[PDB]
Automatic annotation (TrEMBL), chains A, B:
GO molecular function, one term: transferase activity
CDD domains documented for this protein: CBS_like
GO terms, biological process: cysteine biosynthetic process from serine
Cofactor: pyridoxal 5'-phosphate
Residues covered by the Tryptophan synthase beta chain-like PALP domain: 20-288
Highest taxon of source: Eukaryota
Official protein name in the record: Beta-cyanoalanine synthase
KW Amino-acid biosynthesis (keyword) present: yes
UniProt-listed Pfam families: PALP
Entry binding sites for pyridoxal 5'-phosphate: N84, G196, T197, G198, C200, T259, C287
The species this protein was found in: Tetranychus urticae
Length: 294, 294
């Protein structure tokens, strides 16, 4: 367990592989963006080795499948993905010696394949059904998924599906949550994050509510891509997400993605609301680097 | 001194600002790319908050100018740059509350300004003299530099020039070198890196040769952009740099820039040469993320 049972000293010793770079990310105080009262802190998930939080779930999905004997040594892995999850799976399979094949729609920007290809993935571009270059439809995605399912059947590969695999949320129950609890020294009044798979929210919140049943956990929802609509939740507009993505860069020096701006907008709404206790500590997630975007 | 005199616990405590993310980067063992005999290790400078080693020199140039009283509280800063140094200076000035202006040629890809703009820089695009979009000439760069010099004169700003400022190399003498020595537990037989300003090579090597005068330090030279030709040196072709950039991704899961591939190609040539002792430990630098490239 590179993320939990580790004697690796990243600061003062040798890091054995990129797997040991995943997790144990910094918890940064955003004290210039939010000068009080109460405190805003956020996990620096853009400092994972592929620059998103997906490294955590990618490591868990593969490591757990190896541990159970389902994924054999040097067995092929396949995924349909144009996003962060594919970068994470490419990284972990590169280190662990698994051949990796990715399918995605030809409608994607070629930018979406660069990191996966650089990490050894065999990227297969699948013809569009209904969409056109830069407009990838539901039907275009379904055609990519069908190609991946057919290749998996023909090659007897291990299929990765972060929406359907139970170990996806386990990653954050075992790592993200326990790290926030330790880094805050047990001072946290609220946790919030947006939901794609829901793994980060569900796993992290489950752990935090075991340590402090009083902690308030909120799903960050778009008002109406990555994060999706539907317990307790905070809505943020695209305009607000863009606004706080900018403010995070200008006041804290951190260039993160769109979902990060939504998370920061929501956290600031919560801090301004007066719904929490005096001097409340609020934690959210800096999900990925702004560099990961076309 | 966020990089040297620090009581910050990044793993198990709170990181006060992005300045505390700079330096103390992981030293990774590249044991799959190089299975022996001897060992290849490299500093993970792509895990600085702007995803390059330039965060180190950027922090030093500004912090030292504040310490001497040359750069006053809230005083404007200006640089001519289309590269990593501008991202680093944008990050540090954002946190420290300095207005930052950057000039660059209009010939640059608009991609070169995105991170600086996201971190609050006032980016001024300067008309080309001799070049055209995607071909920035020496004369185009000279026109950008003239604009920056004129703005500096008119605004009484603090000018940043990493090629001419003495604190540029000091950063690596005080941080990079001492970290490699600690992380290897004093086992290092060779250090090598390419030279832009030469700050990383000069400062790091100076420190390492004080701890182990037997250590062999090599400049990585292109055969004939960022890294430049001319003590002891190793030449690498563009083809070799591309080849090892790919192998680093495929065998270690790390997606780094072109200069990183040159550094790894050179280190592997040295390890294969038989010029070092049996079981030699060789250290180089993973200078930046592959995401920083158009
Ligand atoms: C995956 C992802 C999310 C959502 O996290 P889940 O754990 O899938 O809910 C948010 N932002 C980014 C950038 C992502 O890649
Ligand atoms: C600055 C830089 C270098 C060179 O380092 P110096 O300390 O200026 O010699 C190499 N690679 C990248 C990507 C750089 O940004």
């Amino acid at each position: 367990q590179s993320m939990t049972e580790s004697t690796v000293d990243r600061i003062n010793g040798i890091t054995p592989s990129a797997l040991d770079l995943i997790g144990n990310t910094p918890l940064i105080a955003l004290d210039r963006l939010w000068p009080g009262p109460g405190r805003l802190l956020a996990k620096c998930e853009f400092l994972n080795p592929t620059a998103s939080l997906k490294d955590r779930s990618s490591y868990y999905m593969i490591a757990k499948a190896k541990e159970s004997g389902q994924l054999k040594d040097g067995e092929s892995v396949i995924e349909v993905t144009s996003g962060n999850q594919g970068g994470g799976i490419a990284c972990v399979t590169a280190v662990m010696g698994h051949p990796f094949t990715v399918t995605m729609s030809k409608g994607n920007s070629p930018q979406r394949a660069i990191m996966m290809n650089a990490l050894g993935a065999n990227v297969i571009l699948v013809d569009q059904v209904t969409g056109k270059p830069g407009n990838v439809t539901a039907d275009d995605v379904a055609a990519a998924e069908e190609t991946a399912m057919k290749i998996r059947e023909e090659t007897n590969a291990y299929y990765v599906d972060q929406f359907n695999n139970p170990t996806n949320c386990l990653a954050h129950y075992e790592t993200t949550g326990p790290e926030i609890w330790r880094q805050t020294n047990g001072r946290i009044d609220a946790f919030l994050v947006g939901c794609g798979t829901g793994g980060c929210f569900v796993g992290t919140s489950k752990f935090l509510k075991e340590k402090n049943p009083n902690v308030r956990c909120f799903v960050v929802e778009p008002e109406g891509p990555i994060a999706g609509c539907t317990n307790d939740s905070i809505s943020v507009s695209d305009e607000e997400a863009i606004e706080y993505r900018k403010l995070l860069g200008q006041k804290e020096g951190l260039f993160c993605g769109f979902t990060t701006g939504g998370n920061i907008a929501a956290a600031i709404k919560l801090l301004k609301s007066g719904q929490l206790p005096k001097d409340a500590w609020v934690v959210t997630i800096l999900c990925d680097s702004g560099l990961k975007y076309p």
